[PDB]
Amino acid sequence: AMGSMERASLIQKAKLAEQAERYEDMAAFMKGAVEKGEELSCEERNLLSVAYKNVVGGQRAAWRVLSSIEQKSNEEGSEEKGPEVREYREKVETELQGVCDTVLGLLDSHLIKEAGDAESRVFYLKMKGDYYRYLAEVATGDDKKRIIDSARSAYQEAMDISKKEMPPTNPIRLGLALNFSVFHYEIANSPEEAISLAKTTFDEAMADLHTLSEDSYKDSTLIMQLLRDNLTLWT
């Protein structure tokens, strides 16, 4: 995609789109950058993630609104409104699944296989778990189980690498554990696994904070607060 635009121009315009809060444009620019075939820098990986996180975030929010309306329409004492709510929820759902498939396609072709460093490989595998998790949020058919296992497998590989290759305060390691814990709680019906992972992650990060500079300390403690927020909600 965007095959006639220079890679550097795509990256520059992705940054401009973020400033203009044009996240669909941002995602299209970063998709074009990925398809140039070169590996992505730390900054460029962040741009890719931010763009699609915003796009799919809007779709998930819309899907939840429409799914809530649909479920109210299918209640005892309901006045038939027609197929419109279901049809429109299906439209948004199909568009969401398309975005997730696009991201998963980028990771599979060929971001993950060329990612050899821990920071890049864990980053992409965390993304893979995330976008399978988003697919799981809307899945109801004969593949909801397979989608959930695909998310778990990606998260698990990322966790194994991060525990071997990263310090316990590494922001990517912390964010991976945070999202994997959300997967356990919200998707896999394993709230005890979710709580245990968040607690162990928080405690081991705390014990490693003494090694950090003032700036890295702020990076890690911010994500630790998110783990604490979830623990407060779950316990």
Binding site: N46, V50, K53, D130, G175, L226, D229, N230
Partner: peptide, 9 residues
């Protein structure tokens, strides 16, 4: 229950 926001670079 919140995942990493990750909407701002």
């Amino acid at each position: 229950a919140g995942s990493i926001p990750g909407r701002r670079s």
